[PDB]
């Protein structure tokens, strides 16, 4: 590999060699909750620190019935493929002269 030949080559230089420089204490989160040991901490007990991450949504694609590809295929939904082996269609053409 070495930075190339991979899915999503724009996120190459951002994800790979920038996070090696920065992530020395893992502090890109939003601190929300703390677990103070007891009613009164006195700054001596080990305080737990609860963090919050940042995740984006998966880029959604609406199913192809809104695409005009449905013209190319009549679509009968089918209930058991492990039960059908070899479906078939038979034509019978009478031919005048």
């Amino acid at each position: 590999a070495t930075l190339e030949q991979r899915p999503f080559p724009y996120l190459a230089t951002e994800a790979n060699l920038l996070t090696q420089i920065k992530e020395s204490a893992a502090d890109g989160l939003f601190k929300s909750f703390q677990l103070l040991l007891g009613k009164d901490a006195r700054e001596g007990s080990v305080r737990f620190e609860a963090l919050l991450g940042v995740y984006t949504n998966v880029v959604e694609f609406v199913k192809f019935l809104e695409t005009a590809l449905a013209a190319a295929c009549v679509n009968t939904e089918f209930k058991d493929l492990r039960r059908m082996i070899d479906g078939k269609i038979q034509f019978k053409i009478s031919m005048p002269t």
Partner: peptide, 9 residues
């Protein structure tokens, strides 16, 4: 270096 560095440089 790879070219994505070269655009940001």
């Amino acid at each position: 270096r790879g070219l994505y560095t070269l655009v940001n440089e």
